[PDB]
Amino acid sequence: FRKMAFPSGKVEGCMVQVTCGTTTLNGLWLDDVVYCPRHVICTSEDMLNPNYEDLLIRKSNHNFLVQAGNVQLRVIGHSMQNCVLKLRVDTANPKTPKYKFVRIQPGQTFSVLACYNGSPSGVYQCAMRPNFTIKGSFLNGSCGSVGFNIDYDCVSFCYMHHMELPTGVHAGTDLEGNFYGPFVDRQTAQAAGTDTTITVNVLAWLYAAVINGDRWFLNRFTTTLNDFNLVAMKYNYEPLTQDHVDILGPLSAQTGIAVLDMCASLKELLQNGMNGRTILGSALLEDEFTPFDVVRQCS
């Protein structure tokens, strides 16, 4: 089982660069609007406690340099929506895919197209942690890189990159500019809160093991969802939601193992350990594969 990104071409055709003064970052060109992090309007010294409303008052359309490659797109309007800037340009992007803006939940995975100066550099899968950080690979100039899922040629944009935390993990917004987690776009000392293991994804991984014939851990017990959630939190595991139970439906139907029966198997794993045995060749339980990821890879 491997981390597989979505093909990135539909998003590559949407990446541009946005410069204000000497600060350049990336933007997302869809139809006639370019979306980018609002801190592009900041001077390096204005990043500690910026007054974005005041900094933007001093900006006009002609202060924004938007480029597809080296080709300038003329800006004809600007506005700020939460933590993102929306620059209306005079050209509709002919490579605009069918798309949606979606806000994802902790545990969901997405592909990141890492970009610098509007030029895509690499693509990789990330999972949103329960503390609303991601373990990205981002360098200076990566802001405005986006995360996405693709379903039947419709690109669902879910993440735009804004910052690195001192622990070296990353934080950002949805495409309406609302941060995931309790972070703000100021170059201040912020810290990721204590993280937890993504229970729904561990369960998805156990189903993947069962699908492939590795099922020693299937026990004879069951549990209630509430009883499981209370024990799981004693082990730094996330509690399950009703939505988690439902997204495990397909894998549960495929294997014939009830979701609550699998929870009881996981609970036993937590209370006694793996006892020197592996699952899918690994001694660690993997929590960055969603139920969709498991089915997507197997079909």
Ligand X SMILES: *[C@H](O)[C@H](C[C@@H]1CCNC1=O)NC(=O)[C@H](CC(C)C)NC(=O)OCc1ccccc1
Among positions 128-147, residues that touch its own copies (CB under 8 A) are 135-137, 139
84 binds ligand X (CB under 6 A): no
38 binds ligand X (CB under 6 A): no
Rounded to whole angstroms, the Cα distance separating 60 from 25 reads: 18
- Out of 36, 83, 143, 158, pick the active-site residue: 143
Q: Residue with structure tokens 């093909």?
A: 7
Structure tokens at 274: 């793996």
Interface pick for ligand X out of 96, 187, 219, 222 (rule CB under 6 A) = 187
Interface pick for its own copies out of 30, 42, 113, 240 (rule CB under 8 A) = 113
299 binds, among ligand X, its own copies, none (CB under 5 to 8 A by kind): its own copies
- The answer to whether 42 is a known catalytic residue is no
Closer to its own copies by CB, 86 or 170: give it: 170
138 binds ligand X (CB under 6 A): yes
Angle at Cα 250 formed by Cα 110 and Cα 297, nearest 5°?
A: 45
162 binds ligand X (CB under 6 A): yes
How many other C-beta atoms can be found within 10 angstroms of the C-beta atom of residue 165?
A: 16
List strand residue ranges (DSSP E) for 42-196, in order: 65-68, 71-73, 75-81, 84-89, 99-101, 109-116, 119-127, 146-151, 154-164, 170-173
CA within 13 Å, CB half, 132: 18
65 binds its own copies (CB under 8 A): no
Contacts to its own copies by CB under 8 A: 1-10, 12-13, 113-114, 120-124, 126, 135-137, 139, 168, 212-213, 278, 281-284, 296-297, 299
